Each structure stands twice: as structure tokens, then as C-alpha cells.
Design a protein around this ligand. Structure first.
Ligand code: DAN
Length: 373
């Protein structure tokens, strides 16, 4: 009946003078440290978002616990006159550059407004750091160079939220998951579709991948090595009572085999954000997928961990394991290497209790799916 016993469970953000939503977790392997980001908002409402805050947590091997340093605002992560949303972190292991992608929206202009008027005013931005978050560069607006001509074709858009992906292709490409509302019919209202932004030069230039032929929203991507190639699995939010899963054989440019995965429930009326990561298989496939998302048929509750030992086969998704009882919403996963018990170690940030705190969970595969051992 109880939720899963884990290595650590600590609230790293709490409502106070500000509210905190939309978690993003990024693991730094060389430091054995985590960077937890979140939207520091004036209230729980989406349009009250303001700045992005951060906390550095250092894993202590002797105690197998993470001690977090004090939170601080990423002062540089903002455009004058705009509120910052959707933190999407990414570390470039080759350049030693830490990236924080996010969107900036004028004052409190809502998503609803952009949708009803078919008028886009959202900006795509970023900030970088060479000392693991100690200091940040000035912000940079990537809208023109990354969206350009397509801007007028979308009512609005967003990235992530959550960790991004750096591929294992020769260029070590940066992949930023996203979605946009497409103006397709003169009368019918624009339909949203997932897609990815792509950079093959360590963040110098960007491009837009193609859309998932389905009414899809927020998504995340993970890279899996099959017996023949590297594939990018995309897991997206949907309003059809089930998640939509698609696959790409060309590093994010095209997604196919789009379909509903009835085993992964989505609550009404439009679903909820979820997270997906790949990690070293304990054993044919080299990597397995772990996914976290609410498991309730009618509301956002009971965060579950799902395992796919035969990725990306839709019917291979396991039944969920209960990670947290009650109100649970957005989440973000990170693989942290080998844990204290020899099995894959995981870090997970998730919204809990009617959006009043963001909890950090650390557990292993042995703890979550013991039947595997
Ligand atoms: C940019 C933005 O407002 N994102 C919001 C997102 C969005 O409304 C949905 O993906 C449909 O577009 O939904 C939710 C949500 O808890 O359901 C919170 C996000 O802050």
C-alpha cells in the first residue's frame, strides 16, 4: 500500500514568498553533482511565472545522500520585460559549457490569448556557464535563428520542460524537445504537435525537426541503442486518454509509427507532462527506458515509474510502480550512474501536493523493479 521505499526523499523547493513549479534536473557526472531548476512564480498560475532559481546538490559517496547548497536566482536568465518559463538544462560534456534554455513571454500575456488570436509572442532564449552555475553569461534570444519563418505558422510554442538531450552521434548534437500549435485550417482551431530543435555545433546554430503526425503537447526524448542503430524515442502528452509515442531513426528530424499507448494513461481533459530517460540495461537491448507520470484515470495523482525492457515497443511497457501517493504532476528524471547497491541510480524531481513543493527522489532499479533481480 505504501509508496516505494527509496534512498532519499527531500523537499528541495517549497512555496514561500514565491511558488515553485515546472522542475528540471541535470546530472553532472564529473562533479557527481545535480542542478535542480524550477520556475519561481508569484503564484501557482502559469501567467504569474517570473524567474528561474537553482540549487546545486553534491552526492556524498560515504553516506549515499545528496546535500543541497542554498537556492539562488539565475539572475541572467531573463529578458527585460518578460517572464521566464520552461527551464530546460543541458550540459555539453565536450566544451564544459552548461546550457539553460527557456522561453520568455511579455508580462502576463497568457497562452490562451495567443491561441484564440492565432498570434505568437513567445521568445526562445538561453544562458551559459563555464563554472557549473557559479556565474552565468548574458542571455541570448534564439527566436530569429531557431524559429524564423515558422514563427507566423504557430499560435504559440514551448520547450520541454525538463532536461534536454545530447546525442552520442559524432557531433554530440544538442536536442531540445518541444511542441507548437499549428495553424492548419481556416475555420478549425489550430492543433498542437510535438517536435525537436536541433544543434550540431555545440549550440552555435539551430534547426527545427519535423512534426509528430498527431495532436500532441509537451514531450521529452531519450536516446536508445538497439542492436543496429541509435533511435530517439519521443514520449508526448495527449488529450486522447493515453500517451502518444513516436520514434525517430534520424536523430530527431522525423518521427514515425505515431500511436496511442493505451498502457500509459493520460487524465482528462488534456493530459499531463511526463518524463522519460534511457539508462544502462542490467543485462539484449543496451538501454532500457524509465518513465514517470501520474497513473490516475481522472486526475493528476499517484506518480508512477514505468519500465520498458524492450524499447521502444509500445506493448512492452510494464505496469507502473507507485513512487508517490496523492497529488503528483510534472516530473523530471536523471540517470546518476551506479548506485550503492550496484544497480542503476536515479534522481527524480516532481511536483507534489497541489503544486506546493517540488520533491527530490533518489532510488535504484533494484528498489523499483526487484523482479528483475
Ligand atoms: C507555456 C505554458 O503556459 N505551459 C503550461 C502547459 C500548457 O498549457 C500545456 O502544455 C498546453 O499548451 O500546461 C501546464 C499544465 O500544468 O497543464 C503548465 C505549463 O506551465
Amino acid at each position: 500500500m505504501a509508496s516505494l521505499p527509496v534512498l532519499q526523499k527531500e523537499s528541495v523547493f517549497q512555496s514561500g514568498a514565491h511558488a515553485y513549479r515546472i522542475p528540471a534536473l541535470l546530472y553532472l557526472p564529473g562533479q557527481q553533482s545535480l542542478l535542480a531548476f524550477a520556475e519561481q512564480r508569484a503564484s501557482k498560475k502559469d501567467e504569474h511565472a517570473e524567474l528561474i532559481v537553482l540549487r546545486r546538490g553534491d552526492y556524498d559517496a560515504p553516506t549515499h545522500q545528496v546535500q543541497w547548497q542554498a537556492q539562488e536566482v539565475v539572475a541572467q536568465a531573463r529578458l527585460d520585460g518578460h517572464r521566464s518559463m520552461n527551464p530546460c538544462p543541458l550540459y555539453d560534456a565536450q566544451t564544459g559549457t552548461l546550457f539553460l534554455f527557456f522561453i520568455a513571454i511579455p508580462g502576463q500575456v497568457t497562452q490562451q490569448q495567443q491561441l484564440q488570436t492565432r498570434a505568437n509572442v513567445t521568445r526562445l532564449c538561453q544562458v551559459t556557464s563555464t563554472d557549473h552555475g557559479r556565474t552565468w553569461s548574458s542571455p541570448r534570444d534564439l527566436t530569429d535563428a531557431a524559429i524564423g519563418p515558422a514563427y507566423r505558422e504557430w499560435s504559440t510554442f514551448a520547450v520541454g520542460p525538463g532536461h534536454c538531450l545530447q546525442l552520442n552521434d559524432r557531433a554530440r548534437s544538442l536536442v531540445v524537445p518541444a511542441y507548437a500549435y499549428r495553424k492548419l485550417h481556416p475555420i478549425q482551431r489550430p492543433i498542437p504537435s510535438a517536435f525537436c530543435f536541433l544543434s550540431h555545433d555545440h549550440g552555435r546554430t539551430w534547426a527545427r525537426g519535423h512534426f509528430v503526425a498527431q495532436d500532441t503537447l509537451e514531450c521529452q526524448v531519450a536516446e536508445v541503442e538497439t542492436g543496429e542503430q541509435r533511435v530517439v524515442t519521443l514520449n508526448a502528452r495527449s488529450h486522447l486518454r493515453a500517451r502518444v509515442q513516436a520514434q525517430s531513426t534520424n536523430d530527431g528530424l522525423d518521427f514515425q509509427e505515431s500511436q496511442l499507448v493505451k498502457k500509459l494513461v493520460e487524465p482528462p481533459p488534456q493530459g499531463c507532462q511526463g518524463s522519460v530517460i534511457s539508462f544502462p540495461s542490467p543485462r539484449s537491448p543496451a538501454q532500457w527506458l524509465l518513465y514517470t507520470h501520474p497513473t490516475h484515470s481522472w486526475q493528476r495523482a499517484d506518480l508512477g515509474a514505468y519500465l520498458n525492457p524492450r524499447p521502444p515497443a509500445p506493448e512492452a511497457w510494464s505496469e507502473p510502480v507507485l513512487l508517490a501517493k496523492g497529488s503528483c504532476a510534472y516530473s523530471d528524471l536523471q540517470s546518476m550512474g551506479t548506485g550503492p547497491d550496484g544497480s542503476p541510480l536515479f534522481g527524480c524531481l516532481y511536483e507534489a501536493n497541489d503544486y506546493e513543493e517540488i520533491v527530490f527522489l533518489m532510488f535504484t532499479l533494484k528498489q523499483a523493479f526487484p523482479a528483475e533481480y
